[PDB]
């Protein structure tokens, strides 16, 4: 029986109901087992908005959760499927998070309402629409169905002129497995623009990296070939087992650096990137 559109459905939640364009949220559905209708191969079963896709695996293939060997749910893009195959008693109660991504459609809003396809309130979900950066800053996201966390990290991007070296030292937060050949940089200064490896990077002598460990590392970049430029540091972080459970993903940095006439500045923080709960229990 498809518990859907039934009584045994008593939530679908999001934490806010305004999104923006390209945002990963997790979308909570709690399930009670009702007098009037109880199981043991029946299904609840949600249908997304066209504005809401569902996160797969990298292989497109469906994210996989399971609540307590009770029962699991496959996530795909144009819906959500929990099936209750076998093992069921007297009262049935639990829940199971899945993210989404917005589309990403351009337009600078869009409002929907939409109760998924089942017997719970209609919500009404609004999408909307879209110098000076301090001498370095660190941001991230999630690489969506890759389980990835991206990172960036923008040095000099006012293309100051340095009378230094420019000293970094990482240290990555917990729950994330640090892919060291995927660094790249993208430079940049009146001359031109490189896309870069680290590989490259180093071969050029813009400056070095050193792993201190698997999740940690020091980058420095050379004062003469770092001056009027800017870098913008892209590399990933792949998302263990401990990892996907986490609230949020982080990652620390202490820089040393020193600008045309001035005294050195040293500044460090945690950047954080919230995670999308993919959770089903009972």
């Known amino acids: 029986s498809e518990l859907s559109k039934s009584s ?10 305004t999104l923006y364009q390209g945002e990963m949220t997790s979308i909570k559905v709690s399930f009670s087992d009702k007098e009037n209708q109880k199981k043991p191969g029946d299904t609840i ?9 569902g996160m797969t695996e990298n292989d497109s293939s469906p994210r996989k959760i399971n609540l307590n060997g009770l029962g699991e749910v496959f996530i795909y893009k144009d ?14 109660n639990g829940h199971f998070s899945f993210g989404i991504k917005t589309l990403i459609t351009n337009s600078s809003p869009n409002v929907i309402e939409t109760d998924f396809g089942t017997a719970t309130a209609t919500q009404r979900l609004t999408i909307e629409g879209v110098r000076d950066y301090p001498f370095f800053y660190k941001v991230g996201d999630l690489a969506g169905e890759s389980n990835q966390v991206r990172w960036f990290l923008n040095v000099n991007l006012n293309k100051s002129d340095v009378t230094e070296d420019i000293s970094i030292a990482d240290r990555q937060g917990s729950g994330q497995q640090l892919n060291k050949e995927s660094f790249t940089f993208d430079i940049v200064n009146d001359k031109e623009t490189k896309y870069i490896s680290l590989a490259e990077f180093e071969q050029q002598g ?22 009027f430029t800017s870098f913008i540091v892209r590399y990933t ?13 982080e990652n620390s940095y202490d820089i040393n650096y020193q600008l045309n006439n001035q005294d050195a500045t040293n500044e460090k923080n945690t950047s954080q990137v919230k ?4 959770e089903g229990e009972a």
Request: hydrophobic content about 40%.
């Open 8 to 17: 045994i459905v008593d939530k679908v939640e999001l934490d806010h109901t």
């Open 45 to 53: 079963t949600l249908t997304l908005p066209d504005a809401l896709v």
């Open 79 to 92: 819906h959500v499927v929990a099936t209750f195959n076998e093992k069921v008693e007297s009262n049935v």
């Open 206 to 227: 813009y400056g070095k990296i050193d792993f201190v460990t698997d999740n940690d590392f020091n980058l420095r970049f050379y004062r003469d070939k770092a001056r």
């Open 237 to 249: 972080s792949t998302i263990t087992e401990a990892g996907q459970h986490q609230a949020t993903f």
């Open 275 to 278: 995670n999308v709960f993919v």
